[PDB]
From Swiss-Prot, chains A, B:
SUPFAM superfamilies from the UniProt entry: Lipocalins (SSF50814)
Impact reported for L66A: Abolishes export from nucleus
Gene name for this UniProt entry: Fabp4
Parts of the chain that traverse the membrane: none
Subunit record text: Monomer. Homodimer. Interacts with PPARG.
A GO term from the CC aspect: nucleoplasm
Modified residues (Phosphotyrosine): Y19
Keywords: Acetylation, Cytoplasm, Lipid-binding, Nucleus, Phosphoprotein, Transport
Protein family (similarity comment): Belongs to the calycin superfamily. Fatty-acid binding protein (FABP) family.
Descriptive protein name: Fatty acid-binding protein, adipocyte
Motif (Nuclear localization signal): 21-31
Amino acid sequence: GDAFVGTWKLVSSENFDDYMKEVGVGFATRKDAGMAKPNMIISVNGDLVTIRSESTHKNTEISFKLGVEFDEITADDRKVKSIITLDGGALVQVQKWDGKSTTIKRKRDGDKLVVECVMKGVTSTRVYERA
Amino acid sequence: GDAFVGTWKLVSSENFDDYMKEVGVGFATRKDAGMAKPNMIISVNGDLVTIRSESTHKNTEISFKLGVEFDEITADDRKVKSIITLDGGALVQVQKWDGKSTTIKRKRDGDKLVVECVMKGVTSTRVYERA
């Protein structure tokens, strides 16, 4: 919906490194990924949704449809299968690969976009705001 | 194949503006798109191919499989249907939207990657080289 559409700047991050350790990201790459403050750009054209994050080195983007499974190569190079849904006003994305799975939840909170990444027990919280 | 895999820097461009005029890109956007020298990063993971171009403002990326049609939102904001194939050592991509269609051909030439965009009569040539 039009609730997520826009450009966002990151403002906070919590327990991100432990979330990364849990998914198996390499030391040099976690250390790197945590030193940057990405921008999240979300838009929609018809029934097609787009999310792209800019960074001073790593830049990615995904184009998908709700409730339709697709193939994704993450920023950290994992070949996963994604399925994104609209569960009660929140964009719920589930990535699954090699028997494991993680869930990324995007939801509005006033003038902020709250993102919560979870990997069996560990949760990281990143708060965004418009730009 | 492993022939296109790598990072590329642009070195030349020819008749690009006329190619843009033909596809209907807006004046301010063509003027902008031509002042930048993008980088093309191509990689493969299993049967999944990835092409992403970096620029000091506009950054995009596509993930696809050969011979399988998919939905794409171009850098200039056109919602097109793409189909990419391997026609005799050349990556041939066809975009189609609103009764029209364009063809982008990527092929090797020594140590260069030659790209040729065509829109009924008009052809633009952009030459890349490794980085």
